[PDB]
Amino acid sequence: DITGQVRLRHADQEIRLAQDPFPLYPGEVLEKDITPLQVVLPNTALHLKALLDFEDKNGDKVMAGDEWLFEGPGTYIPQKEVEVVEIIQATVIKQNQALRLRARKECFDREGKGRVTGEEWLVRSVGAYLPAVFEEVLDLVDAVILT
């Protein structure tokens, strides 16, 4: 800054990754340091509410109500705007079972059915399955034996 003090972005923050060591500067506040990058297993995903509207890497606009779902074996890169709500393991589904679910908000499910709030539906698919950010896990439902 013209005063000779370093200029500051104030309310804005600053994420960092791997680089050569750097001096801290006056007026800075180190909220965070030294942590392995957010690793994630293939059969689990990150649930991520926006704090405020922001640009996406793909050019997509992001509403504050939007819920990101980062699935797959990887290491997610945090944004100062992105907030980490939680983590959800994918639900395994053994043969002859169905994954009961509920709609916490109006939307479309992977089945493609229109989903009014409070609606419930089966998940026919066998094997591991990841619930959607609106989808809520309940229980596996075994098929009744029929001799």
């Binding site: 005063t3 000779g4 060591p21 001096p23 801290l24 007026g27």
Partner: peptide
Amino acid sequence: EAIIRIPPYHYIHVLDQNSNVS
């Protein structure tokens, strides 16, 4: 004291009172 030996991977936030800035 007036003498300040800075180690190669180290830093200090000096506060100049004349310009009233760090």
